[PDB]
Subunit: 381 residues, 4 copies
């Protein structure tokens, strides 16, 4: 009584879906470096030996897709056929067209920037919670940090048997204080990570407990009853796109709040700011974080929605879980007085023409690195 379990997951940089997200954002950044107004909707698919780029780009940039893609795969760490994938020798296929003129004319052609229409219809959510300093659920924060630690240990040579493809999952036991949530302990941790053929299972499991989990999880959350599922499959030599097809926008919950809050369904990666799936979700996080860091609530969910070609949101909704003294209608009035959620204004407030998107494409878009949507707005009311 009083307590509940909640589970979130994360994946590593070499997870095949995350490879695609990073590639799509490497392509977007490559365009934005030359043409800040590039319209980009780049999807990536990865399978054994293949990166395929599909989608719509209208840009003045001259982009060497072979170079951009292969350098992103190189950074991930897939550089030899022994690892199952190699940037030097894989197939890069490109099926990219111009943005449809019907779309262009409906959304941005001949518009003043501040009044550009939403690039599509859709709904988007932002969330924030005071349970961590990052204003993110602990479950997802820990899941991400476990994967980041694996990559650190791989890249510094502490654990040279590690590969790039990894998944993690953290279940935390919580209690609730008046609609806010308070983490008590880590209940279960799962880690699966691709490895070389020479390392034995007990060495891997020992290292994952001692060098990864204990290096990442605050000791106050771990106890003798914590359940560890470390390399639970027994063997994970084949990995990366060879083991499992990857697509852009197939880790949208990993990218956001790990099951907490809500999601409107739109992927982030490979999309420029006129795609409100990305710009308005970023803005909504910025709103949610601003409400919490401003002391107006402890936990909050923000919904916004759009129609293609229409610049203002169709709806805005605030849910505070009972964690404010203000009514949800009062918070909504405060949001409406302080934020302009048109895509052509968000772009200016969050500096969304800057080529920083590849950095967002692993370890979550929120809760790290003081990106502009992570810097709270000082609210007037």
């Amino acid at each position: 009584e009083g307590t509940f379990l909640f589970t979130s997951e994360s994946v590593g940089e070499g997870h095949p879906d995350k490879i695609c997200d990073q590639i799509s954002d490497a392509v977007l950044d490559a365009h934005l470096q030359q043409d800040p107004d590039a319209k980009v909707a780049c999807e990536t698919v990865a399978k054994t030996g293949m990166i395929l780029l599909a989608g719509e780009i209208t840009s003045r940039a001259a982009v060497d897709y072979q170079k951009v893609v292969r350098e992103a795969v190189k950074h991930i760490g897939y550089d030899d056929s022994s690892k199952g994938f190699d940037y030097k020798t894989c197939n890069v296929l490109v099926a990219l067209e111009q943005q449809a003129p019907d779309i262009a004319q409906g959304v941005h052609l001949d518009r003043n920037e501040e009044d550009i229409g939403a690039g599509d219809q859709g709904l988007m959510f932002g969330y924030a919670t005071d349970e961590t300093e990052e204003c993110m659920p602990l479950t997802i924060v820990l899941a991400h940090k476990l994967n980041a630690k694996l990559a650190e240990l791989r890249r510094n040579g502490t654990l040279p048997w590690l590969r790039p493809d990894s998944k993690t999952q953290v279940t935390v036991q919580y209690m609730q204080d008046r609609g806010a949530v308070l983490p008590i302990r880590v209940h279960t941790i799962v880690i699966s990570v691709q490895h070389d053929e020479e390392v034995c299972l007990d060495e891997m499991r020992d290292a994952l407990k001692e060098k990864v989990i204990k290096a990442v999880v605050p000791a106050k959350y771990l106890d003798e009853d914590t359940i560890y599922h470390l390399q639970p499959s027994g063997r994970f030599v084949i990995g990366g796109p060879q083991g499992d097809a990857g697509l852009t926008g197939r880790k949208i919950i990993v990218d956001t709040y790990g099951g907490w809050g809500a999601h409107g369904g739109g992927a982030f990666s490979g999309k420029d700011y006129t795609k409100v799936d990305r710009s308005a979700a970023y803005a909504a996080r910025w709103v949610a974080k601003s409400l919490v860091k401003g002391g107006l609530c402890r936990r909050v969910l923000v919904q916004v929605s759009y129609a293609i070609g229409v610049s203002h949101p169709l709806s805005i909704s605030i849910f505070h879980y009972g964690t404010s003294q203000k009514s949800e209608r009062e918070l909504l009035e405060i949001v409406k007085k302080n934020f302009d959620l048109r895509p052509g204004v968000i772009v200016r407030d969050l500096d969304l023409k800057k080529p920083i998107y590849q950095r967002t494409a692993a370890y979550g878009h929120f809760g790290r690195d003081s990106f502009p949507w992570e810097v709270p707005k000082k609210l007037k009311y």
Copy 2:
């Protein structure tokens, strides 16, 4: 005060992401018709003139991928280059391998069926709400029905200018009664639908209001202040994969609860029952619907999670929004007494080897057609 807006969206059968979901499930069904134990993880990508199949299948079935894919595209209604895509003449590319042996050995090889391991780690949610007879949010129910009506009118020749690619979005104004939600009115409707070159915009907008919206939305929810954004882009001749790349599992919120409840991130389409992203999400809906139709609550969210190779769930969580007299811990005990959420048991309870998955792949997986996960379990406690 008292009221809030909530928005959900749906897409039609010819939306490019939904084309991929249907194709992936057409491939899964084709395998299951010959081999009930087929292991299938089929991703589809669609772009101008191309369907590519990527992923992992181990099966005794002999499947003609050209036929399966082209017949699915035919059923959708893409049968002429005038529509932007044609089943007769498009490229079908196949990049399908066996399931990795490391995965096979970790999950199912040499196991008794009831004890097969989860096919992957992950988290999943089920939701139900008493606001409609289907136990689904009204916003998403209406969004789906609008798209189904467009397809009906297209296929019966009432509106021969319609094409297969459509999107809809419904914003409802709600009030809340003790954690349950009560729809009051439709606030905003968006409809975008691909059309022929000859029909003018006013004829389209008139037909969408009179023949679609008024045929679908109960008149009590529509009033003089309802906002209509009908063909808001102005022109939507290019559509289907020519206008926008499609991928499997890029409509996961449309597939489920339209933003309500929560989502764990896993796509459904192209996956057999050992993939708990599908089987355990279906089971969780079945749990949630059983709790509501059993009179134990008005609204409920269920989380479950798994580790690869481990048959029992790692966590189960019940959230009732305050709509039960029973505590969440009591509901959890009732769930645990009445359901066995191992994938190898769910498969038997929900008959998940049957080739009915193509039917799930448009208009939502939940709230329609009395699929087995939509038939409440009589609970003992």
Copy 3:
């Protein structure tokens, strides 16, 4: 006694192999329009709904591959799914990389143009015969003209049931005068041409005899014993890449001399002048035609060969079939005194940086249009 049969074939513009040749040369021309020194090795593959570009290009040009490819397919006449292929709606996939640096450094980097090395090893032949004014075998000349007539009648609407995919084959009865050949009559003609579903076979066969064959073949060569195989398959509705995969460089005998003379194996299309498969074969035709039009022989075959990185030919050989009063060694001395067969000199003599290559890619590279290799050199000796 005294007489022999000889057969050659040609194909139309919409034959799938010829589609690829035209596309590859459309890509080469697109580069050369912006960058005269572009290094291009572009292979094309065509199958139902797909054009794939594969190969190596290093160029300063910015080329819109989608536009270039689709416009070439448009010119061919594949513009509706009813025809089996449509430029508007097919898949264009691009798998193009830079020229390998090892190759670049071996062949052209840091060289004076006149001394660039051959771009590869290989052997090449040129041929000419005085039997026609074009200095080409009659069999191949007639085969080409039959296909050109089909395209004319298709494009002017005389025969609107015609499609773009066609093949023709002509067998001529010859006699020999002292190593020269003298055509006597057409023995057999084959024509297969893709057609619409509505035209009946007898109408097609009547039109092919009356409007095609009689419009093209000089009446002196046709007689009552000439054999006609017109639509010999009975039905040819499915055609173009839907019926048969196409690749660049799979019509190399159609491109040259129809079985007469000899061939060294190198394709022409998609290659810039540093590829001696194209430049030295063109030069060798130019030599052969110059010998014949200069009155030094009636019929002649020229072989040249190269090594990668080496500018001068490794061998030059002249075969006159007994049709000269000069010995083959004397003709060789005349060739060596009058031509410089280094690729960096040929490029200047034949103006091979000019973007005229798409025009070469159907109906043969030789015997038509007064291209520079078809204008005889005045010989000094």
Copy 4:
């Protein structure tokens, strides 16, 4: 005076065009092992990290394309990303359809086997020459043996720095005796072969002269004036499909007579016996070799041609270069009395349903291994 040069080339097993030929024939053999009447027209394209299969197959066989393709690449020796290509990790894409019904009905449906129609129109040549025991030109025989020696030394570890991609070219000085040709000496040899990064150029050139050339070329043909172009590019580390796109049927002169004789343009690899490009070219070699080994001539060229759907050849022509006492018309009568060149009879005489085609796909189809078309027919006249 009296003498002439002639040049031919060959390529190794790992040359990218030859990789495609071998793969296409590996696919054909895989079908024929299960279904002797399989209709196969399989084209392969190779580029960095990619094997794509395109074409038309109608067969009762169940063929695992991933396995067939990857095993062929393995046999070639591309097994690590250090070599530029790896069977374990490359992309295999499949775009294979059924044979068009229009073609099937025109050629073979409902026909007695002996009377099946030619699978296409086309012309084909056979050649034989008494200059070697294999009845092949010395230039091409030597070119092939040089590549076979490189592969031997690579596979036995004598030269571990060798890779699979190689090209060779041999120029021989000949004299002519009454239309026959008599080799006098090797004039020039070119060898280019892919190599590891660690071996220096002088070590490679020394080994190519001493361990390859001197092991293959009879010493009587080599002298102090022979020209050697060994690794003439200077550096050949990048090779295989990474360096140069490969397609099936782009080595048709290497496959046949190295420039001698003539060629009708049809590729061999990936085609079953109903494709007369392969069956009738094999038959024509068999005719030519039978004439020479029967003492009827020293050197001979045979042309045959076909129409789609027509079983008998449209033309047969014999050219003896003046090397027979019999007239060409008498040789033709002897051929017509002794051979039945219908595809449905050739299949029986040459046993063309047997899965031996992968063995034909490198080092030439003729002049080796006592294949049935290399075993002379005893002629009656």
